[PDB]
Enzyme design. Structure first.
Site, mmCIF file in Angstrom:
data_model
loop_
_atom_site.group_PDB
_atom_site.id
_atom_site.type_symbol
_atom_site.label_atom_id
_atom_site.label_comp_id
_atom_site.label_asym_id
_atom_site.label_seq_id
_atom_site.Cartn_x
_atom_site.Cartn_y
_atom_site.Cartn_z
ATOM 1 N N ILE A 26 -14.001 15.940 85.355
ATOM 2 C CA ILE A 26 -15.388 16.408 85.593
ATOM 3 C C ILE A 26 -15.837 15.787 86.912
ATOM 4 O O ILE A 26 -15.693 14.585 87.113
ATOM 5 C CB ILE A 26 -16.335 16.026 84.446
ATOM 6 C CG1 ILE A 26 -15.770 16.488 83.101
ATOM 7 C CG2 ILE A 26 -17.758 16.502 84.682
ATOM 8 C CD1 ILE A 26 -16.682 16.176 81.936
ATOM 9 N N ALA A 27 -16.391 16.616 87.772
ATOM 10 C CA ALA A 27 -17.121 16.207 88.979
ATOM 11 C C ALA A 27 -18.161 17.294 89.239
ATOM 12 O O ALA A 27 -17.833 18.486 89.031
ATOM 13 C CB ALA A 27 -16.166 16.042 90.137
ATOM 14 N N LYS A 35 -9.196 1.297 89.441
ATOM 15 C CA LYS A 35 -10.017 2.525 89.411
ATOM 16 C C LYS A 35 -10.941 2.524 88.198
ATOM 17 O O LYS A 35 -12.131 2.924 88.370
ATOM 18 C CB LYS A 35 -9.117 3.750 89.373
ATOM 19 C CG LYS A 35 -9.882 5.037 89.167
ATOM 20 C CD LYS A 35 -8.979 6.210 89.493
ATOM 21 C CE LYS A 35 -9.661 7.495 89.114
ATOM 22 N NZ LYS A 35 -9.859 7.544 87.652
ATOM 23 N N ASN A 92 -4.083 17.397 87.154
ATOM 24 C CA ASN A 92 -5.266 16.556 86.796
ATOM 25 C C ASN A 92 -6.417 17.426 86.255
ATOM 26 O O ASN A 92 -6.734 18.508 86.829
ATOM 27 C CB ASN A 92 -5.749 15.711 87.971
ATOM 28 C CG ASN A 92 -6.577 14.535 87.488
ATOM 29 O OD1 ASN A 92 -6.018 13.542 87.029
ATOM 30 N ND2 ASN A 92 -7.881 14.676 87.534
ATOM 31 N N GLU A 140 -3.429 15.110 82.110
ATOM 32 C CA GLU A 140 -4.387 15.074 80.970
ATOM 33 C C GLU A 140 -3.947 16.012 79.832
ATOM 34 O O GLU A 140 -4.136 15.629 78.689
ATOM 35 C CB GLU A 140 -5.822 15.414 81.398
ATOM 36 C CG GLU A 140 -6.585 14.240 82.009
ATOM 37 C CD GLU A 140 -6.301 13.909 83.470
ATOM 38 O OE1 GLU A 140 -5.518 14.681 84.094
ATOM 39 O OE2 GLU A 140 -6.934 12.929 84.015
ATOM 40 N N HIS A 167 -9.246 11.176 90.905
ATOM 41 C CA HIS A 167 -7.943 11.883 90.961
ATOM 42 C C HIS A 167 -8.096 13.212 91.708
ATOM 43 O O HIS A 167 -7.101 13.656 92.291
ATOM 44 C CB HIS A 167 -7.352 12.032 89.560
ATOM 45 C CG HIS A 167 -6.856 10.736 89.005
ATOM 46 N ND1 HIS A 167 -6.543 10.590 87.668
ATOM 47 C CD2 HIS A 167 -6.601 9.544 89.590
ATOM 48 C CE1 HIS A 167 -6.126 9.346 87.465
ATOM 49 N NE2 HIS A 167 -6.117 8.703 88.632
ATOM 50 N N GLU A 217 -29.116 12.041 88.851
ATOM 51 C CA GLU A 217 -27.768 11.500 88.527
ATOM 52 C C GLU A 217 -27.854 10.455 87.412
ATOM 53 O O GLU A 217 -28.975 10.135 86.991
ATOM 54 C CB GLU A 217 -27.152 10.928 89.805
ATOM 55 C CG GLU A 217 -26.102 11.847 90.417
ATOM 56 C CD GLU A 217 -24.850 12.040 89.569
ATOM 57 O OE1 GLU A 217 -23.983 12.838 90.000
ATOM 58 O OE2 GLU A 217 -24.746 11.410 88.471
HETATM 59 C C1 LIG Z 1 -19.048 13.356 81.750
HETATM 60 C C2 LIG Z 1 -19.340 13.399 83.231
HETATM 61 C C3 LIG Z 1 -18.542 12.701 84.102
HETATM 62 C C4 LIG Z 1 -18.798 12.736 85.471
HETATM 63 C C5 LIG Z 1 -19.874 13.497 85.949
HETATM 64 C C6 LIG Z 1 -20.714 14.200 85.080
HETATM 65 C C7 LIG Z 1 -20.390 14.181 83.711
HETATM 66 C C8 LIG Z 1 -21.235 14.934 82.722
HETATM 67 C C9 LIG Z 1 -21.844 14.994 85.745
HETATM 68 C C10 LIG Z 1 -23.043 15.451 84.897
HETATM 69 C C11 LIG Z 1 -21.260 16.223 86.444
HETATM 70 C C12 LIG Z 1 -22.493 14.103 86.816
HETATM 71 C C13 LIG Z 1 -21.511 13.479 87.776
HETATM 72 O O1 LIG Z 1 -21.899 12.093 88.015
HETATM 73 N N1 LIG Z 1 -20.155 13.507 87.278
HETATM 74 C C14 LIG Z 1 -19.153 13.108 88.192
HETATM 75 C C15 LIG Z 1 -18.143 12.246 87.724
HETATM 76 N N2 LIG Z 1 -17.177 11.767 88.536
HETATM 77 C C16 LIG Z 1 -17.189 12.133 89.794
HETATM 78 O O2 LIG Z 1 -16.218 11.670 90.621
HETATM 79 N N3 LIG Z 1 -18.130 12.957 90.321
HETATM 80 C C17 LIG Z 1 -19.126 13.507 89.538
HETATM 81 O O3 LIG Z 1 -19.927 14.258 90.090
HETATM 82 N N4 LIG Z 1 -18.030 11.976 86.368
HETATM 83 C C18 LIG Z 1 -17.036 11.001 85.897
HETATM 84 C C19 LIG Z 1 -15.577 11.493 85.869
HETATM 85 O O4 LIG Z 1 -15.354 12.687 85.069
HETATM 86 C C20 LIG Z 1 -14.686 10.341 85.367
HETATM 87 O O5 LIG Z 1 -14.739 9.245 86.284
HETATM 88 C C21 LIG Z 1 -13.223 10.723 85.157
HETATM 89 O O6 LIG Z 1 -12.435 9.588 84.762
HETATM 90 C C22 LIG Z 1 -12.593 11.313 86.404
HETATM 91 O O7 LIG Z 1 -11.272 11.872 86.029
HETATM 92 P P1 LIG Z 1 -9.941 11.239 86.733
HETATM 93 O O8 LIG Z 1 -10.285 11.324 88.217
HETATM 94 O O9 LIG Z 1 -9.762 9.813 86.232
HETATM 95 O O10 LIG Z 1 -8.836 12.234 86.273
HETATM 96 K K LIG Z 2 -9.617 12.428 83.562
HETATM 97 MN MN LIG Z 3 -6.777 11.889 85.848
#
Ligand SMILES: Cc1cc2c3c(c1C)C(C)(C)C[C@@H](O)N3c1c(nc(O)[nH]c1=O)N2C[C@H](O)[C@H](O)[C@H](O)COP(=O)(O)O
Ligand SMILES: [K+]
Ligand SMILES: [Mn+2]
Ligand SMILES: Cc1cc2c3c(c1C)C(C)(C)C[C@@H](O)N3c1c(nc(O)[nH]c1=O)N2C[C@H](O)[C@H](O)[C@H](O)COP(=O)(O)O
Ligand SMILES: [K+]
Ligand SMILES: [K+]
Ligand SMILES: [K+]
Ligand SMILES: [K+]
Ligand SMILES: [Mn+2]
EC number: 4.1.1.102
Lengths: 504, 495
Positions: free
Chosen positions: B167-168, B387, B164, B229, B187, B278
């Protein structure tokens, strides 16, 4: 004559502001004049003055479109409204609405009768005019008639003479000497019509004045209280007695500088087909004619080179949005404060199509009331939705002190992030509903009842201890000395600034 | 090329005149973020900070606002388009179609290469201290220096069959640890739980910054559970991604990654995390919680490494352009797979990415012979139990006349066609997104309900068809007259 007291001077003021386009080539009142005006309203361009309408005869008439619509530039956005009121063209909506409310607690200034004025320069008796031969616009292709009346002032008086009302209600040509239009509760034209109908003796003496003093057309659009003569309210607002002349065929008084005056009767018995019409929410329902009130015209008087103002209303942004919403929101602010609710500011965001009002709460005074969202929502809804000034508004959004309710983006941000759907809202089904909103008159429920909501975008601590967040924005998430350094070096680093007086 | 290499992407922003290079000294303590925040609030050019106070042996330069909007309407989404090999004038429809294109293609597995630019430099445990690097403080009340706002977390299922990329957020906890959000239904959390139940070892982990722009777009999209991915991005770009093995574990990172951290996500340990400014535009300064703890064992990086940074908050940044838009893309596809007649989906920016507007094919709706109450319930049941619908609290159903990519058209339809109460179905027994202020700081359960489907379809859209015309220039005037007005516009005196 000052621009706010004389429509002809108002037209000259727009020219001096570079806010007028004079179209001197032939323009068809069949759709073309309104299509140009519609494009102006959708792009916030200069007001069109049609000096050469196909069908103009014996000085009837030129058309000014978009008299109360927005300017392109952010700094003088509301300059056309400011020019109705002798305000600087940079005036904020807070300053325009404070002006419109200022007469609320002042003694009325009665109008002054004068022997004549420009509105007497030309006259046509019933044997000399035909309303079907004037260059009356077809405003939208599916309209059920030619709407001569979109920005004139109806004048009617109570049978006992104590109340003279000025208001805008639409009317269309029915035949050579009749109009039909909307005379609907709870409007004052309807309240007065009902007094004449219940007396049962006479048709209502009536005049319709087009191109009236701009300050009077603003009061004409405002739901000032029942029983209050608009002319005295306008006098007080402007600090001047309005000059009025008697009608030739009845004892009503019309503004001396009126461009065009119709004199006649509003029937207490007869109706005729009215509508459909392209309306404020942005819709026309082509299959939708109803019986409307019927007006008989006995005489027309008019200025040399008379100018008929015209609202080509529909989608954003026109007079129905800038004047109807804003002036209803002003009166709602005053109603809330008189019922001891801690409201500082009210505005109908343009994004809501005149259907929401955002109420800014003084949360210091909310904290002292020691209440809850459920109790406060019910109290606000029961005041506003059981008053005429709340009739056209279906959603109230309560916001705290940090939100500027005159900025639609700040209201939508607060609504989307602070109001939990269901839990933080109270629905009102047992209040008058506004049938003209498509989801009411063309919707799944009763056309005239309910469909209203109070949406609380106050956060929980705003009711108890005070705001417990900072915005994640440039203004609140960086110290003052850092923000000033970034602003001072902005162009030096190679970024660009929007110039306050130029940007759209 | 720009979509396969972050360094080439920076070069593309230069050619597009969409980059400001700042060579004077900039403080990572708020100044870099304050410049980026003002860029995002005004849709200005992306800032490249080439000279951060405290840069240590090439760690690191910062690019702000990598996925934010451009000022002009003609190339509004061009910074996103440049992630995906699309022209800078690309529409949101075209961007989201590109992101969905790989859904029904065979994955293209990655190519393993012996080395790449991300191996140009390396620091073991004795050679780096995360507290000494120029990591930004992004907002004055943040609970830490958020090193991780636009990097890609890489974790793999215990059985090796799913890798996987996501971004988090993560912040520096000490010299060799981060803390971050690892939250259901994400994920990274699903894979974390797999390792927790196994109970034997911490999760092998890498965080890659400045990855192939096409990969950071898939990193922010909710592609299905179990889908790697890398293979999705391969299929979408029509190329195999080049990956290199980490030095200290068997995870594979993009060969051209600017900066790579290698280590472990703990199955037992937590540390203080947040608060953070946020995506909904708030920080609650009183608000620290225990988050997931990551141990960093190794840092590898390019010469003249660039760290991308999201200065997130009020409109408009990567949290709006990428999170809302890519979730809306997945929701469109989910509706179509459940036989719902949805053509388009978008999260209006005005909604602070809490709403999705669903454009209905009303010809297909009329053939279903259904009612608002039935259709709203079916749409909500599908989207709010998936989801991809987690972060969205309001669905707005609109007919074929509304462009859902235009927030003004969605707000018009919502305000005029949806009767409050009667034309809405509330959903209280569905997962709710705690990060929205009205949920985690609101009057109700932080993790449950607060969702609604708002039907902005008019009654005849379900039966006989639209029975209105808009009172607009487009619909209330004949075609020949509209053309005559546009042809004569400048000749009459208009602009
Ligand atoms: C583009 C982007 C996406 C995310 C985040 C940021 C950016 C810039 C931060 C600036 C770091 C702020 C934060 O809110 N952040 C973030 C987040 N999801 C989370 O669980 N936790 C997070 O802290 N997402 C969203 C996730 O990236 C998406 O939901 C994605 O679909 C997850 O991937 P998957 O689990 O489906 O593989
Ligand atoms: K993803
Ligand atoms: Mn994924
Ligand atoms: C500025 C403006 C106001 C109104 C209207 C228009 C304009 C431009 C039309 C373009 C003609 C369209 C139509 O919707 N119209 C209109 C209307 N009120 C009606 O009962 N009927 C109408 O047909 N108002 C609103 C009223 O003018 C206000 O509600 C006012 O408060 C009434 O005065 P009063 O009864 O309070 O004295
Ligand atoms: K009035
Ligand atoms: K609330
Ligand atoms: K259904
Ligand atoms: K509806
Ligand atoms: Mn009145």
């Amino acid at each position: 004559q000052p621009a706010h007291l004389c429509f002809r001077s108002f037209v000259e003021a727009l020219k001096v502001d570079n806010d007028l386009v004079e179209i001197n080539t032939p323009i068809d009142p069949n759709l073309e004049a309104a299509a140009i005006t519609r494009r102006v309203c959708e792009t916030n361009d200069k007001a069109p003055l049609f000096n050469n309408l196909i069908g103009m005869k014996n000085g009837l008439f030129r058309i000014l479109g978009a008299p109360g619509s927005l300017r392109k530039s952010s700094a003088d956005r509301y300059g056309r409204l400011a020019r109705h009121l002798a305000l600087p063209p940079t005036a904020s909506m807070r300053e325009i609405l404070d002006k419109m409310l200022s007469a609320s607690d002042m003694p009325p200034i009665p109008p002054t009768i004068v022997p004549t004025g420009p509105c007497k320069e030309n006259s046509l008796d019933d044997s000399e005019f035909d309303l079907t031969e004037l260059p009356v616009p077809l405003i939208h292709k599916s309209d059920g008639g030619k709407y001569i009346q979109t920005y004139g002032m109806h004048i009617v008086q109570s049978p006992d003479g104590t109340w003279t009302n000025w208001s805008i209600a639409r009317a269309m040509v029915h035949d050579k000497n009749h109009l039909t239009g909307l005379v609907i509760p709870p409007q004052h034209i309807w309240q007065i019509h009902q007094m004449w109908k219940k007396e049962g003796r006479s048709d209502v003496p009536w005049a319709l004045a087009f191109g009236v003093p701009p300050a009077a057309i603003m009061a004409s659009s405002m739901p000032i209280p029942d029983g209050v003569t608009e002319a005295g309210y306008v006098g007080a607002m402007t600090g001047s007695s309005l000059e009025l002349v008697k009608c030739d065929t009845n004892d009503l008084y019309v503004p001396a500088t009126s461009e065009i005056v119709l004199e006649g009767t509003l029937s207490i018995s007869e109706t005729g087909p009215e509508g459909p019409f392209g309306e404020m929410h942005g819709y026309i329902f082509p299959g939708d004619t109803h019986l409307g009130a019927k007006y008989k015209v006995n005489r027309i008087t008019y200025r040399n080179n008379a100018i008929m103002p015209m609202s080509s209303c529909g989608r954003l942004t026109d007079e129905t949005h800038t004047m109807i919403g804003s002036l209803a929101a002003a009166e709602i602010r005053k109603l809330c404060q008189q019922n001891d609710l801690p409201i500082t500011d009210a505005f109908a965001p343009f994004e809501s199509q005149v259907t929401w009002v955002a109420l800014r709460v003084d949360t210091e005074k909310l904290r002292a009331m020691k209440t809850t969202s459920e109790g406060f929502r019910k109290r606000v809804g029961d005041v506003v939705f059981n008053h005429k000034a709340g009739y056209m508004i279906h959603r109230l959004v309560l916001v705290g002190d940090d939100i500027d309710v005159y900025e639609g983006k700040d209201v939508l941000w607060a609504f989307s992030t602070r109001c939990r759907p269901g839990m933080d809202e109270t629905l009102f089904e047992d209040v008058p509903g506004f049938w003209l909103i498509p989801y009411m008159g063309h919707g799944n429920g009763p056309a005239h009842r309910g469909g209203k909501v109070v949406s609380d975008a106050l956060m929980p601590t705003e009711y108890t201890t005070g705001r417990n967040w900072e915005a994640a924005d440039f203004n609140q998430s960086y110290p003052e000395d850092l923000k000033q350094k970034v602003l001072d070096n902005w162009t030096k680093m190679g970024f660009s600034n929007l110039e306050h007086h130029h940007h759209h």
